[PDB]
Structure formats: structure tokens, C-alpha cells
Design a binder for this molecule. Structure first.
Ligand SMILES: [Zn+2]
Lengths: 64, 48
């Protein structure tokens, strides 16, 4: 459910860096490589936005 | 004839004669279901 915020290995904040991420791999014709434009030189955490599942859009639609 | 009732038969979720079958994803949620369920099971006495 939603980006982890703070990568698992370092501290590099990733809560901020997704509302902007998704607006490239599906909205700018840049590669998975495009995240490099977000200051992701380390492995590391950058496999954080990448290996992530958006499990809330598909959970939020159960309205009580 | 007579159309009389003869006991009850437990249905298997997501079948040709189930309550869902041809229901679109967007409408499975409304019912508190999960578009990933693939049926296969019975819910007799409340448990799969
Ligand atoms: Zn990291």
C-alpha cells in the first residue's frame, strides 16, 4: 500500500519521489532509466519505487 | 404437475448459474468481492 517512504537500506526519502515518478514511465516517453533523473545513483533504494505495487487505488474502492 | 421443493443444493461460486458469472470488474467491488478470486470453492456453513 503506497510507496514505503524512506528506502529500506539508506534514508533517502521516497514518499515525495513517486507522485512525480509515475508521471514519466507513463507520461514522458523516458525509460525505467528516467528515475536516474531523481537522484537515484545507489542500488539501492531506487529499487524501491521500481519494485513497488500500487495496492491502494485497487483497495480504496470498497467504500463503507 | 406440482412444482414441489426437494431439499437444497450448495452452489459453487463463479459458475454458469452463480450470482456473478458475467459481472464486470468495476461491479465486483460494489459487492465486496475481489476481481482476483477465481471461484473454485463452496461457502457452506460460512467457511470456504
Ligand atoms: Zn536506499
Amino acid at each position: 500500500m503506497i510507496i514505503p517512504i524512506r528506502c529500506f537500506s539508506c534514508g533517502k526519502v521516497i514518499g515525495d519521489k513517486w507522485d512525480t515518478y509515475l508521471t514519466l514511465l507513463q507520461e514522458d516517453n523516458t525509460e525505467g532509466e528516467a528515475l536516474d533523473k531523481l537522484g537515484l545513483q545507489r542500488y539501492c533504494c531506487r529499487r524501491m519505487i521500481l519494485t513497488h505495487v500500487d495496492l491502494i487505488e485497487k483497495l480504496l474502492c470498497y467504500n463503507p | 404437475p406440482s412444482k414441489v421443493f426437494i431439499g437444497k443444493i450448495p452452489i459453487m461460486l463463479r459458475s454458469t448459474f452463480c450470482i456473478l458469472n458475467g459481472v464486470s470488474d468495476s461491479e465486483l467491488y460494489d459487492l465486496n468481492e475481489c476481481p482476483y478470486d477465481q471461484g473454485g470453492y463452496f461457502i457452506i456453513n460460512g467457511s470456504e
